[PDB]
């Protein structure tokens, strides 16, 4: 439900980090974001592409802090905890 | 109509020699008399006499994913000419 906005990945390899997302993959439920870099290899010794994680993620717009995203009233449109700006 | 009477062309070394005496080789949709092909290929290109000869083939086997299955039926029809010639290559 996300198309390249901000997040804070909290509960994975290394946390406290943020970044912006690529394909959400609705079926596998796995998003692509800067924060994991597999050492893939083809015939280079390594490749350093970008890999995915399950949704252990959260958004942050006004508080500059993770909150439970909360799609609220119809004006649909997002309406977060403390502040209500677009997703 | 022409569409569902001519399904594919065919090319090979066989057809390559065949084009010496102005022959060609198509594959048709099945359940087509020989004659419809004549009047229809006539309809579409204006080429003609040197009537047709034709065959069938039974479907072979194949294993692509270690599961059994058969190829598809194949009715091949051999066209030959007396009146100009056709190239669509």
């Amino acid at each position: 439900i996300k198309k390249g906005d901000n997040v804070k990945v909290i509960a994975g390899k290394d946390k406290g980090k943020e970044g912006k997302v690529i394909a959400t993959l609705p079926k596998k439920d796995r998003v692509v974001v800067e924060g994991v870099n597999i050492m893939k290899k083809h015939q280079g010794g390594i490749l350093e592409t970008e890999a995915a994680i399950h949704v252990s993620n959260v958004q942050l717009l006004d508080p500059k802090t993770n909150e439970p995203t909360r799609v609220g009233y119809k004006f649909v449109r997002i309406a977060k905890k403390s502040g209500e700006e677009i997703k | 109509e022409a569409r569902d009477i001519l399904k594919r062309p065919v090319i090979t070394e066989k057809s390559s020699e065949a084009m010496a005496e102005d022959k060609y080789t198509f594959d048709v949709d099945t359940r087509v008399n020989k004659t419809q092909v004549k009047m229809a290929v006539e309809e579409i290109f204006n080429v003609k006499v040197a009537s047709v000869n034709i065959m069938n083939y039974k479907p072979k086997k194949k294993r692509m994913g270690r599961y059994q299955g058969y190829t598809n039926k194949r009715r091949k029809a051999i066209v030959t000419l007396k009146e100009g010639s056709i190239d669509l290559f």
Binding site: - | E1, R3, R8, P9, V10, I11, L88, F89
Partner: protein, 65 residues
């Protein structure tokens, strides 16, 4: 392409069907030569024919009642 079709006469419907079929047969007939690189174009064509015959049939009904 849903109501471009509704703009027709019930007679032009036939001609674009035929010409679309010749367009198609050109593509199918090139296809095994390997001249073609386009793959997904054919679906658009065949689906168009489906649309034209569909609407022709619907108006065939509503010209019956």
């Amino acid at each position: 392409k849903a109501k471009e079709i509704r703009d027709l006469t019930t007679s032009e419907i036939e001609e674009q069907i035929k010409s679309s079929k010749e367009e198609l047969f050109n593509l199918r007939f090139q296809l095994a030569t390997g001249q073609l690189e386009e793959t997904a174009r054919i679906r658009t064509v065949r689906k168009t024919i489906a649309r034209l015959k569909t609407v022709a049939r619907e108006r065939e009904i509503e010209q019956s009642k």
